[PDB]
Structure 1
Amino acid sequence: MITMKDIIREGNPTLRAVAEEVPVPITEEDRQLGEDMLTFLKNSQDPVKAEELQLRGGVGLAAPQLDISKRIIAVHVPSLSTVMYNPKILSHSVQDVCLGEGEGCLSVDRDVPGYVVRHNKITVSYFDMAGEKHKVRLKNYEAIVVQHEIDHINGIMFYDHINKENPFALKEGVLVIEL
Structure 2
Amino acid sequence: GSHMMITMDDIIREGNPTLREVAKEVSLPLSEEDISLGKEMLEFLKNSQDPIKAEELHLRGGVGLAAPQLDISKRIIAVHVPSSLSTVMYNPKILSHSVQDACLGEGEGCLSVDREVPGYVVRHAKITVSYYDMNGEKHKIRLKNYESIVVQHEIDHINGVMFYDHINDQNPFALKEGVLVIE
Task: Using structure 2 for the length normalisation, give the TM-score.
Answer: 0.96
1:53 is the counterpart of 2:57: yes
Question: Residue 74 of structure 2 aligns with which residue?
Answer: 70
1:157 is the counterpart of 2:162: yes
Question: Residue 48 of structure 2 aligns with which residue?
Answer: 44
Displacement of 1:31: 0.3
1:146 is the counterpart of 2:151: yes
Q: C-alpha distance in 2, partners of 1:94/1:47?
A: 38
Q: C-alpha distance in 1, partners of 2:109/2:89?
A: 21
Displacement of 1:104: 1.5
Letter in 1 for 2:72: I
Q: C-alpha distance in 2, partners of 1:95/1:163?
A: 20
1:125 is the counterpart of 2:120: no
Q: Which runs of 5+ in 2 are unaligned?
A: none
Match of 1:101 among 106, 109, 114: 106
Q: What fraction of aligned residue pairs are identical, expressed as a percent?
A: 87
Q: Which runs of 5+ in 1 are unaligned?
A: none
Where does structure 1 differ by over 6 angstroms across 4 or more consecutive aligned residues?
A: none
1:25 is the counterpart of 2:29: yes
Secondary structure of the residue that 1:90 maps to in structure 2? Answer: strand
Q: C-alpha distance in 1, partners of 2:108/2:89?
A: 21
Give the RMSD, CA atoms, in angstroms: 0.6
Task: Using structure 1 for the length normalisation, give the TM-score.
Answer: 0.98
Deviations 1:11-70 (A, max 9, x none): 000000000000111111100000000000000000111111111100000000000000
Question: Residue 116 of structure 2 aligns with which residue?
Answer: 111
Match of 2:17 among 13, 16, 21: 13
| Matched-pair contact (CA < 8 Å) for 1:41–1:59 | yes
Letter in 2 for 1:167: P
Q: How many corresponding residue pairs?
A: 178
